[PDB]
Write a protein that binds this ligand. Sequence first.
Ligand code: VVL
Length: 134
Amino acid sequence: SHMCDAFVGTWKLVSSENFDDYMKEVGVGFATRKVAGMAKPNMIISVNGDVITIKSESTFKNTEISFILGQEFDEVTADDRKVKSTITLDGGVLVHVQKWDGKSTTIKRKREDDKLVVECVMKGVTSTRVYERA
Ligand SMILES: S=c1[nH]nc(Cc2ccccc2)c(=S)[nH]1
């Protein structure tokens, strides 16, 4: 047993708050915001040795990242940003920092009760997205 066991599985989005405003702050344009804001993704998390894989799948976009904690990687986000990402575990929370064009956003993923809560922050704007097991 290990690091991220409680994150592993298949998760479905059940609620969202403030995601449009978060996307505005990130620089997402109108049409992408509308279509992405409609998405109801599933998030599929798996671990094999030191490698964590997170897939996001929706009618908008299917993405997949694989990474080792603490080890930077380049990521193309669903909204087509080219970012440099580092994901760490901080007191049981997965903390994902994305850097691009002098900007930064942080995505935190945590287990709370039977939920996986995703908090996305870009400057003063936070969006909270709640997932439940599929
Ligand atoms: S929690 C969650 N992760 N990833 C996506 C795709 C996405 C990422 C960044 C900006 C726009 C859309 C969604 S819709 N929800």
